[PDB]
Design a protein around this ligand. Structure first.
Ligand SMILES: CN[C@@H]1[C@H](O)[C@H](NC)[C@H]2O[C@@]3(O)C(=O)C[C@@H](C)O[C@H]3O[C@@H]2[C@H]1O
Ligand SMILES: [Mg+2]
Ligand SMILES: [Mg+2]
Ligand SMILES: [Mg+2]
Ligand SMILES: [Mg+2]
Ligand SMILES: [Mg+2]
Ligand SMILES: [Mg+2]
Ligand SMILES: [Mg+2]
Ligand SMILES: [Mg+2]
Ligand SMILES: [Mg+2]
Ligand SMILES: [Mg+2]
Ligand SMILES: [Mg+2]
Ligand SMILES: [Mg+2]
Ligand SMILES: [Mg+2]
Ligand SMILES: [Mg+2]
Ligand SMILES: [Mg+2]
Ligand SMILES: [Mg+2]
Ligand SMILES: [Mg+2]
Ligand SMILES: [Mg+2]
Ligand SMILES: [Mg+2]
Ligand SMILES: [Mg+2]
Ligand SMILES: [Mg+2]
Ligand SMILES: [Mg+2]
Ligand SMILES: [Mg+2]
Ligand SMILES: [Mg+2]
Ligand SMILES: [Mg+2]
Ligand SMILES: [Mg+2]
Ligand SMILES: [Mg+2]
Ligand SMILES: [Mg+2]
Ligand SMILES: [Mg+2]
Ligand SMILES: [Mg+2]
Ligand SMILES: [Mg+2]
Ligand SMILES: [Mg+2]
Ligand SMILES: [Zn+2]
Lengths: 150, 208, 237, 138
RNA sequence: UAGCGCCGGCCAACUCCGUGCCAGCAGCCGCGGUAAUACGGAGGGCGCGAGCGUUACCCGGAUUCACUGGGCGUAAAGGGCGUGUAGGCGGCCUGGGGCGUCCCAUGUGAAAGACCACGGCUCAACCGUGGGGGAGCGUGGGAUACGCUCAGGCUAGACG
RNA sequence: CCUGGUCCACCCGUGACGCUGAGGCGCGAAAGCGUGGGGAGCAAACCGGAUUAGAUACCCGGGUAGUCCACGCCCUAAACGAUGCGCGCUAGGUCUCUGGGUCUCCUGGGGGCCGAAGCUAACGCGUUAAGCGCGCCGCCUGGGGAGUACGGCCGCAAGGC
RNA sequence: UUUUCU
């Protein structure tokens, strides 16, 4: 069914009278490579607990990517926070050309050939959110037609 | 010059079983049958999740070590495949598969690709009559690839083309065990090949 | 079922501390009150009830919510008639959104009523024993109606969407339709099935809710009964 | 004064649709009406109509949106997702029939202004003409 | 004939010994003051191979001079305020011109190089033949929506 | 007394006469400078008392320039909303200053607060935008060296650009 | 009132 890729895990802290109290953050991508993708970010005292909570969260936040011959219906640019992500469709043989974060997401999304580009703040977390947001605004001629009918 | 050096160790590192030899990499020997783990002191300790790099790296290494071609040549070929019309992945495989040494290996004149290379090098192989000794020579569709009249008596070539009686040959090839001739029908497709390779990953490795 | 031209109760309400988004239902402001368009109140009732019979006959559950004092008692009466759950006291954060959890509170409840009644009701320190009496009273105070839900409802009926906004939120987030008797002081865009009319007033409320329960009862395999809640409307006056 | 009326109208439309108005007025001008006709034909708006306001000519632009949605923020999807002026004063933009951009792989459109009249990138590409690249809609 | 660099993260490749904030490493973060995958050696390993590595310089990553493609309340960044010259920009309707702009045809755009095909040297590098495209500019013809210009009209800007 | 700006009403007049604005020109808090005058109070410097390990300070007693006026210079500033100007567009609520109307409300100009959508790194902004747009000007391009050096222009000088 | 350094 779903496949899980571990995007990134950070250690994070918080000072306390007595010492630093660590916590863990994990970004998790869950997909079927069929046009079903999920992003989850969960924290917890131990890495595992985080990672697990992460996948769990991911499965609860799926996007239905309108794949189309290994690529995407059209180009979009989404700005999340100070982070900008740009997706451009590509012909076969190109591969998934993108940085780790958008990639892992795009791969499990079932995407197989895309042209990508991170702009602005390259915060993995915010870049991931933007990639997702982008995949979401993806439309098909069908959808567009449906929207402008009547 | 080409690699040289223990081969059934690359198999181990690459995980998959590469057939860098003949008869043996079939016997219950080719290390992958004994110790299917990478060479060296830490070959058996737990393996850490590979980085995207490692992944793409290994994949290329694998595909490349199969045809035992250098990185230089391997790369140039890739760039050519990349420049032509049509899916780079397939095309690239097609070009590698068009190397004379490979075709000689494909026709059974040689037990392994290395052996094939040496056959070509020592002029034991011929392309449409004229003899060619460039392992890198590119066989095109239509070319007849035979064994040297003079060489047709070499024990090895006898032994080999003998075992070929029976064995089938790639759908892009045709062998005439009779006169020790072979013919390059067409460029093999990705579907024709069954390499333990993820060409998508190799294409990506060069993206970076 | 139904009854129109009910100026006899609802219509106009709320000073003028309105919500511009509710203009599509305000007929005209007269000496204060914005006054609701009763025509539309019907048009909405039509569609909304249609949706209720839908669930009703289909065997679907509806969670009635009315923390407000104006409809606190009523929410019970009517929710009692239809075998429907309700929230009267205070909406706990996450009843829907954190159901699996806030449900254990109900397990604990039953578990306690079981302890009392007779088995071991008097076997341990009268101190600990009276401590339990509290949990019960409390659990019974907040879970008296939310006790029925065995799974997330197929819909929610809200008395004052603004007053009961957190509820409306969890519903939304979970994709549970939202039915609501709501007026001037609110955002209609958040109500899936609206009923524009007086959010307060025991009289106003009672009417809408009752008929919705008459309609839930009917269209389900039963026969309509006059609401005993109307006794509360009289008493209120 | 309005430095750029076309940009003005595109923005009124942009602003009105972001709050979901039904109608929306923009001061009347032939050219404006021309652009609007494409918007309608392309199904971006319900249509428009010449109307008089305070004795002056405007253009009711009947906007249109997608259907109500689920979960939080059930706000309709937009029909006009994007609408931006390209050619602008102090910075004009002209393209040859072979430089006409393809908006969102055709899912979107562009509105040129040629000597053959206001056309969409396709209409223009067809008549084989180029011109001032007025705006991009999608 | 087989060599050279590397194995803390970036970055593919880990262990033992020696050393003890020393000797040294270092592109950046940083490493070494007795358990150092970071210093030196060894074993093992990764990368490439008659090469490998360093230093230097150009472009890239750098949307970090932002035309494509950035900014200025508190991060660098609004001029102390105004009056106003040059300049930049310019509401609605009609008509003439056709400068900008758009279109077609034509001339030019050497060869080499670049792209494609076939071919010569056993391959390739290298080279032969052929084909294709090509900004800009000249000339001829055409279009007039927008920008321009000229002429006329308007009152929603402006002023009285 | 002389004099600038500005808002509302009527819709009367002109008929795009508009916006911005490098340079220029003018204005520009305090301190400061030149000439003359004035000088109660205050008060750099300074002269003393005290406090302190010391006290070139904070506290107390005095006190000159100055603070004031006229004329002429200087031109700086947390000269701040730390937010260039103009125009159009985008929920409301509430307080307030000023005008009109059919005046327990409506309509305009201005000053505040809470907030729709939206924006923002966040804080926050939100019809008095930091939202959505068009026009023009100014300015930024890691920190230190340094607002320094040099050159030029300005100034009586201090010093400014 | 004042009342340093670590
Ligand atoms: C004197 N009692 C204190 C007091 O209870 C402190 N919390 C208010 C408590 O704080 C702790 O619990 C902590 O969190 C950290 C530790 C340094 O002191 C711990 O022990 C601290 C206790 O010793
Ligand atoms: Mg941004
Ligand atoms: Mg290719
Ligand atoms: Mg442009
Ligand atoms: Mg590694
Ligand atoms: Mg030493
Ligand atoms: Mg040691
Ligand atoms: Mg190292
Ligand atoms: Mg070492
Ligand atoms: Mg070589
Ligand atoms: Mg650049
Ligand atoms: Mg720019
Ligand atoms: Mg910047
Ligand atoms: Mg600053
Ligand atoms: Mg200012
Ligand atoms: Mg001017
Ligand atoms: Mg004009
Ligand atoms: Mg012309
Ligand atoms: Mg030409
Ligand atoms: Mg040849
Ligand atoms: Mg006056
Ligand atoms: Mg008049
Ligand atoms: Mg006139
Ligand atoms: Mg002074
Ligand atoms: Mg003086
Ligand atoms: Mg004194
Ligand atoms: Mg004193
Ligand atoms: Mg001054
Ligand atoms: Mg006001
Ligand atoms: Mg908001
Ligand atoms: Mg606010
Ligand atoms: Mg420097
Ligand atoms: Mg001088
Ligand atoms: Zn093997």
């Amino acid at each position: 069914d779903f496949e899980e890729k571990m995007i990134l895990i950070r250690r994070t802290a918080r000072m306390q009278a007595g010492g630093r109290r660590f916590r863990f953050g994990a970004l998790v991508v869950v997909g079927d490579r069929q046009g079903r993708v999920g992003l989850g970010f969960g924290k917890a005292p131990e890495v595992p607990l985080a990672v697990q909570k992460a996948g769990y969260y991911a499965r609860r936040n799926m996007v239905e990517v309108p794949l189309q011959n290994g690529t995407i219906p059209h180009e979009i640019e989404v700005e999340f926070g100070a982070s900008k992500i740009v997706l451009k469709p590509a012909a076969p043989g190109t591969g998934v050309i993108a940085g780790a974060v958008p990639r892992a997401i795009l791969e499990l999304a079932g995407v197989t050939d895309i042209l990508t580009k991170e702009l602005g703040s390259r915060n993995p977390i915010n870049i991931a959110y933007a990639t997702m947001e982008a995949l979401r605004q993806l439309r098909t001629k069908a959808d567009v037609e449906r929207l402008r009918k009547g | 010059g080409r690699y040289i050096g223990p081969v059934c160790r690359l198999c181990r590192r690459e995980g998959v079983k590469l057939y860098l030899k003949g008869e043996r990499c079939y016997s219950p020997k080719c290390a992958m049958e004994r110790r299917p783990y990478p060479p060296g002191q830490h070959g058996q300790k737990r393996a850490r999740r590979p980085s995207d790099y490692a992944v793409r790296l290994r994949e290329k290494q694998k595909l490349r070590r199969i045809y035992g071609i250098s990185e230089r040549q391997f790369r140039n070929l890739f760039e050519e495949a990349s420049k032509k019309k049509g899916v780079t992945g397939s095309v690239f495989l097609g070009l590698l598969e068009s190397r004379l040494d490979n075709v000689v290996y494909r026709l059974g004149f040689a037990v392994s690709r290395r052996q094939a290379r040496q056959l070509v090098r020592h002029g034991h192989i011929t392309v449409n009559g004229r003899r060619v000794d460039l392992p890198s020579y590119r066989v095109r569709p239509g070319d007849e690839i035979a064994v040297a009249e003079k060489s047709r008596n070499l024990e090895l070539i006898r032994q080999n083309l003998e075992a070929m009686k029976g064995r089938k040959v790639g759908p892009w090839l045709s062998l005439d065990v009779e006169g020790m001739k072979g013919k390059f029908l067409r460029l093999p497709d990705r579907e024709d090949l069954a390499l333990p390779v993820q060409e998508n990953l190799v294409i990506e490795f060069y993206s970076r | 079922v139904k009854e129109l031209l009910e100026a006899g109760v609802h219509f106009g309400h709320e000073r003028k501390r309105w919500n511009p988004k509710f203009a599509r239902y305000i007929y005209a402001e007269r000496n204060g009150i914005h006054i609701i368009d009763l025509q539309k109140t019907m048009e909405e009732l039509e569609r909304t009830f249609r949706f209720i019979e839908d669930l009703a006959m289909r065997g679907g559950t509806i969670l009635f919510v009315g923390t407000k004092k104006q409809a606190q008692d009523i929410v019970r009466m009517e929710a009692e008639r239809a075998g429907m759950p309700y929230v009267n006291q205070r909406w706990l954060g996450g009843m829907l959104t954190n159901f699996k959890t806030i449900s254990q509170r109900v397990h604990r409840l039953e578990e306690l009523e079981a302890l009392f009644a007779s088995p071991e009701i008097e076997e341990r320190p009268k101190k600990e024993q009276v401590r339990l009496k509290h949990e019960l009273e409390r659990l019974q105070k907040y879970l008296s109606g939310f006790r029925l839900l065995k799974r997330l409802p197929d819909a929610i009926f809200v008395v004052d969407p603004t007053k009961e906004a957190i509820a409306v939120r969890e519903a939304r987030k979970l994709f549970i339709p939202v039915i609501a008797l709501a007026d001037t002081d609110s955002d209609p865009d958040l109500v899936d099935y609206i009923i524009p009319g007086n959010d307060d007033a025991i009289r106003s409320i009672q009417l809408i809710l009752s008929r919705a329960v008459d309609l839930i009862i009917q269209a389900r395999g039963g026969v309509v009964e006059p609401s005993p809640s109307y006794a509360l409307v009289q008493e209120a006056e | 004064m309005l430095t750029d009326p076309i940009a003005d109208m595109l923005t009124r439309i942009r602003n009105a649709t972001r709050v979901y108005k039904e109608s929306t007025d923009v001061p009347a001008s032939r050219f404006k009406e021309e652009i609007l006709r494409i918007l309608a034909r392309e199904g971006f708006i319900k249509g428009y109509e010449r109307v008089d306001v305070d004795g002056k000519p405007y253009l009711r632009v009947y906007l249109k949106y997608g259907p109500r949605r689920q979960g939080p923020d059930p706000r309709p999807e937009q029909v006009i997702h994007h609408i931006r002026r390209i050619s602008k004063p102090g910075r004009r933009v002209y393209v040859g029939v072979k430089e006409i951009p393809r908006v969102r792989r055709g899912l979107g459109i562009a509105i040129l202004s040629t000597s053959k009249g206001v056309l969409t990138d396709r209409e223009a590409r067809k008549l084989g003409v180029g011109g001032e690249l007025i705006c991009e809609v999608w």
